[PDB]
A paper describes a structure:
Derived from an alpaca immunized with the prototypic SARS-CoV-2 spike, Nanosota-3 has demonstrated high potency against both the prototypic SARS-CoV-2 variant and an early Omicron subvariant BA.1, both in vitro and in mouse models. However, it is ineffective against a more recent Omicron subvariant XBB.1.5. In this study, we adapted Nanosota-3 to the XBB.1.5 subvariant using a novel structure-guided in vitro evolution approach.
To understand the structural basis for Nanosota-3C’s potent inhibition of XBB.1.5, we determined the cryo-EM structure of the XBB.1.5 spike ectodomain in complex with Nanosota-3C at 3.19Å resolution. The density at the interface between XBB.1.5 spike and Nanosota-3C is well-defined in the structure. Compared to the structure of prototypic spike with Nanosota-3A, both XBB.1.5 spike and Nanosota-3C showed significant conformational shifts in the loop regions where mutations are present. Detailed examination of the interfaces revealed substantial structural changes due to these mutations. However, in the interface between the XBB.1.5 RBD and Nanosota-3C, these interactions were replaced by a π-hydroxyl hydrogen bond between Trp60 of the nanobody and Ser490 of the RBD, and an aromatic π-π stacking interaction between Trp60 and Phe50 of the nanobody. Thus, the mutations in Nanosota-3C align precisely with the mutations in the XBB.1.5 RBD, enabling high-affinity binding between Nanosota-3C and the XBB.1.5 RBD. The data revealed that the A60W mutation significantly increased Nanosota-3A’s binding affinity for the XBB.1.5 RBD, while the other five mutations either slightly increased or did not significantly affect binding affinity. These results align with the structural data, which showed that while the A60W mutation introduced new hydrophobic stacking interactions at the Nanosota-3C/XBB.1.5 interface, the other mutations did not create direct interactions with the XBB.1.5 RBD. Instead, they primarily influenced the conformation of the RBD-binding loop, with their effects appearing to be synergistic.
Numbering used by the authors:
A (entry chain E), B (entry chain D), C (entry chain L): 1 to 115
D (entry chain C): 22 to 62, 81 to 140, 150 to 173, 184 to 240, 255 to 303, 321 to 466, 486 to 525
E (entry chain A): 22 to 63, 81 to 140, 150 to 173, 183 to 240, 255 to 303, 321 to 525
F (entry chain B): 22 to 63, 83 to 140, 150 to 173, 183 to 240, 255 to 303, 321 to 525
The structure:
Amino acid sequence: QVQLQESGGGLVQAGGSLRLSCAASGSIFSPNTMGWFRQALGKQREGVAFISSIASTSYWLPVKGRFTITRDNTKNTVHLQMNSLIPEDTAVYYCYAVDKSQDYWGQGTQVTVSS
Amino acid sequence: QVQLQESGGGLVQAGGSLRLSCAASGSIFSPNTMGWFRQALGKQREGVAFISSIASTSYWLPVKGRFTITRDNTKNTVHLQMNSLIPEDTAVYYCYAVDKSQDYWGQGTQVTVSS
Amino acid sequence: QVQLQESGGGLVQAGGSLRLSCAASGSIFSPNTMGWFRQALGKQREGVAFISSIASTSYWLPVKGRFTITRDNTKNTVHLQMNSLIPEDTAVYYCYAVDKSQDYWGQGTQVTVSS
Amino acid sequence: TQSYTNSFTRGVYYPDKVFRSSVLHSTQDLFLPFFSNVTWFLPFNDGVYFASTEKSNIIRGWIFGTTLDSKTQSLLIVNNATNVVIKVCEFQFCNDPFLDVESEFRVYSSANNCTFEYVSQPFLMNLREFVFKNIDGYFKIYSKHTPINLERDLPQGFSALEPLVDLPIGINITRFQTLLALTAGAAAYYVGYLQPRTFLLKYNENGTITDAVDCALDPLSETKCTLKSFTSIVRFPNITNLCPFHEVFNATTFASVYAWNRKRISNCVADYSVIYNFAPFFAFKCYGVSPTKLNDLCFTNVYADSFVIRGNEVSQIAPGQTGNIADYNYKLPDDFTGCVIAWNSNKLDSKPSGNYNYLYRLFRKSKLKPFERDISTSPLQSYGFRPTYGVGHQPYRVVVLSFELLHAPATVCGPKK
Amino acid sequence: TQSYTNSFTRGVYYPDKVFRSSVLHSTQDLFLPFFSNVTWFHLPFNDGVYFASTEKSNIIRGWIFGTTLDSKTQSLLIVNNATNVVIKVCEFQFCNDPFLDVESEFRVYSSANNCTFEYVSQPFLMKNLREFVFKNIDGYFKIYSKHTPINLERDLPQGFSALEPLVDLPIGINITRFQTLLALTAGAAAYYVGYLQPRTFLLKYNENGTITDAVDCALDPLSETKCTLKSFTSIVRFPNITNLCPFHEVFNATTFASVYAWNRKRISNCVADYSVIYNFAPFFAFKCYGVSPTKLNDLCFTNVYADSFVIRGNEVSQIAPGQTGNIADYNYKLPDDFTGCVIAWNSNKLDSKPSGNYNYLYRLFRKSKLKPFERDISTEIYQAGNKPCNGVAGPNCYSPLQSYGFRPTYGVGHQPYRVVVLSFELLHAPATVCGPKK
Amino acid sequence: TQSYTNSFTRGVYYPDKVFRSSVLHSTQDLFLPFFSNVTWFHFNDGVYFASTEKSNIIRGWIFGTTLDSKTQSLLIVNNATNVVIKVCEFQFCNDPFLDVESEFRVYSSANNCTFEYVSQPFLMKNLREFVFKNIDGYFKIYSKHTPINLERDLPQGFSALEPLVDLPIGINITRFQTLLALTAGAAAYYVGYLQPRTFLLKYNENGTITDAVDCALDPLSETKCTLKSFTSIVRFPNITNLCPFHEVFNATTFASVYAWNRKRISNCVADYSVIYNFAPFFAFKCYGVSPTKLNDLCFTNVYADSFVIRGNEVSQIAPGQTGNIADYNYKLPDDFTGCVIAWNSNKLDSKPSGNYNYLYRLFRKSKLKPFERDISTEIYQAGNKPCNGVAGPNCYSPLQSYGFRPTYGVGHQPYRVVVLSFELLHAPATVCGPKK
């Protein structure tokens, strides 16, 4: 049984910054890939961005610069740095641990920006 | 051999009533349909009425609401009643059994209405 | 390549007479058999009559007296003499050359009788 | 009013219409074996030996029936002083059909239609014996009247049975009954069954059978027949571990189709009753093994691949098949051995706003060779499942069991002892 | 002027083209039997011809082979000379008497015509006997030939010589009659003609590969022994015919009912003879689809179905598989794959009266069509308008049945016609119905 | 550097998992033939691999086709704990070797692969022998470890090779390589290559192979085996031409079946590519010869027949078959030697009004002898007075037509049929030119 702890969300004004963090404990087998999905209010779930275990990054949005992905190999955790916030990214965020056999999902973090 | 016996014709003054009946004997498979036809000297066979095994009564235009049919299931016979007779009804009548096979006709019944 | 020339068709009143003729030019090998087929308006095609190369005739309809087949050995042609025309023969005609290898067909002629 | 009695040597009929003289012949056919049990007073099996000994001719007619009512075709044989009538009409019989002497309403309440009629000289005219045999659309009756001296049981004698009539009716039959004509009366008859055996028959010089010997009654008769003259252990390994099929099932968390869960099952006793009591599976197919015969074999390894697919794409899980799920998600080898199972999960994984935790692949450069999945990660699109969705779009849980044979001594087999 | 003589041991040719030496071989083919009659002249072709002559001044110079010997058949012609042998196969319109004028071909034939073949080669001809064997088989025309010295003699020489192949033409035309062609003014010459038959010979090849002896295998028992050692030193009886299927009942019933109420009769468990069918009047329609009328007695089935009714004269064509019409889909529908026969004949003399015959009705309106082999009997008001008919006629409420009318003064196409259709079927049961059998 | 030495009596492994005792058994399988040269270093159909070092310096094996990340490559890693087997298309370097422990020098990165396996490692004065063989998608590893005295070369003795693993991988393999784990060093190993042979193995009473003899080494061994004890030119003709098969097909005019056209073909090069080039034939069946081998035989004379048949009757054309056209229109001999082609023509030989233009005979007094044609139009006599006039009563007229509309379904649409008949074992053949 794996646990994906999510932290760092909340209310931020326009142009602010925050640091989302997902730590995967439990099985989280060696050939893991860690991703972030976005869920808009009552809408389809699209993908924020994925980081692999060989440091390769695949962003699924023309959003480079906005999200930046940092990896912790010692603890095998993934951190998303959020900067230059605009109201169109107001959506909850989950992290996705594909592992190697059984993919998982996070609990959820509320990220809100308005002015 | 299927023999159908016709009776009840004759001479009647205008506005009178007559009482024809034909009883069928022979094979008469149960899904039987028996009707009556009119024929006057110089004119062809004109359908008077019909009843099927469903006991539904069907009548033609020239005799609207003036002739009636009753069906006996016990003896499986057909009784035709003439009411409100007029000289246009002066013609011999033949009752015809549709049955499911070779069709049998009658010997005729003399019905005369004149004043 | 074989060309079959047909001639003699058209409009004729009832009880008339005419002379259809088919001449075969081209390969048309020696032991041939020639004939005439009938096509009624929008119906099947029936064989009017057949003549062989040994003058043997086979009429495929009980119609003798009406058609007569004559053979021209020198030019290898066939004439159908039409007499006492009746309206049920109003149909187009083709001639049929079976030859020895592969049979052939004509183009078509309009034969019409009415009153 | 039953009793049992011994048959002695009775019930031998001419096998065919061939004439032979003074030659012993060997035949393989249906006969009533020597010294068997016969009942004294009904299933039909393969043939019947019937016998009675009354002089009053009260017995008259056998009612052959498969349903014993007006529902299905029944043969009725009636006998009177003038004729015999054979009918295939399905009469409406009663509990105790019996004649009146002459109304037949007692025997049967009503009549119906049929497609056969036969009339001939009556069967009957002392002991009367009949043999009834039906085979390949042919009903054959053999009969014999034998005058017996004042005696109790079937006589110590021999009498052949001559053919009486063949009828090409071609209907199956299983039962028959007895008719009586009426005051108090007494009836008694013997009934025996036929069996496939081999007989040796002796013809005299006029063509009439005079003696016969069974070929299995006792070793002396076996000698007479052959000389043609008248002068499994089951063992299995002791391990009792139950295979973890229940853990794979009802896990309340099935992975995405693009990353299907693979589990290896070995060194246990595999039971597939959980397969059937689990749920009314929508799809249950097997390729290399008969689904009903999974309980009687030995297996080396078991593989279980579990995933979730759309309702209309379940058919895409098949060896040698094309499709987006087939070519970019999961492909089965053409020689794949195992089973595929699929059940609806609409009431489990259909959120009111839609569930997007399941995703599938649409874009890839190359096809997927069998037995490998893609992990690298828009080339991947999430699923959508809602309760309002109709059939063909609700989520379905699909599990494939990959099997292998012809390997080291099998361990996963203890379904039998 | 014919004559007869003895063939002796002549006319053996190499059957094929394989070299052999010092081996005794057995061959089955057409040959001229030993010691047979060979007509001596001064003609049918059959299976082949052995032709032998001795006239050394080229008096004999060719042959004409053909079937009918006129333009009606291409006539193969072989002409010899000193320059070049010539073979033609053109469709020569043959004259009454063939001969070369010496050299116009007109007396042989009228006009040169289409010929896909023509051949020229070294002259065939070379006290000397010349023998030829002509035969055409499997669309090939083979000529074998040989010549030998001889002392002056009036009959075939005693001795032996084999015949080597000369030509093998791929012509493939039929020949049934041939005729020789001399070189004269009157005169006479001599030649011998014999006919080949199938036989079995035993040929002996010497060391150099040439046939030097051969023995027949049917001449006399000694030759049969030589061949064997392979060395040179209706009654029909059947049960009496009693149970005839009754067809004279389904015919002349005098009551065929109506088309909408057609009687169906099932025939089984009897012998069905179809001859009596042709004992009635010539039939307006006699059509069999799945069975050839000639072989009905030869092939037999399980059960037969007969349906008889009376329809109009012009509606006869509508009674067939694949047809559409008021009588086709509302009164009697036939299956597409129907196997059986249809008979129809006029009955105007028997089903028409001057006053009017209206006992033959037919369906006119129906809600839907009819499945093949189905009948509808119920008579209810056919509702046409939106409002219910309520079991009565009136506006858009018409009866479904209409009565036909027949009177003797009517023209063709409307007079009553009796139609009887016979349908045949097979199933998993004994046939029990087959035709009469001698 | 390389060197050479003799295989001696080495490389014998239990062919099967079947127990036997005190019985000499003959096997036919892949082995390393006796007294052969095996290369000494300082794939084909199998590998015999051998080494003798003690420091565990030797480890791992790479198998592949390209030694690149474009194709799957077997990888067997060994360490003191376990043995790891993978099938991943690694990006191998020029001289892969274990760092000792990173694998980046062995290869760049991991990628697509299915089989991952872990077990007790094979490795444990000592010599180690292995046999690797790949067959029908199965990869079998046999092993043995022997205590060898102080000897430079392979010892003179016998040692059977038990199975170790059997994997269902199925990868196309052409080459393999061995890795080292190191500071410079030196080590050696012997490699030999398998071949198919026949052996005679001797099992003792305990079930272990003790000796075996090669059946094709020297005549003495051949005698031991049989006794079962231990004591191009082508000269085709010069003519080049083209058989007008194009003229037989696409003639736009086919004859009716009761008068079927006949065309004789000879004196040309028979090329049959155009046949398959024509159309997706509904039926294409050859009886006396395989359809693929028409392009390398020679025939005396060939015949082409062409006509049109209702589709459901196409099966009616076959030797020894019955049917109206089988016995009345076109009879094929029982000993047919040729091909038959039949393809749909519903788009060309059908008309809404009814393209009749095609007849067939169904009444005929006698059965047709094979390869006959009948062209008479005489009115069939039924057994009565001569109806020279007309069919009339019992007499009948033959030759009904056909009716083709686009509305008819399959089984009534027209199909064009061409039958090729061949001539064998005759005068010198002429129709063959597809080869020089």
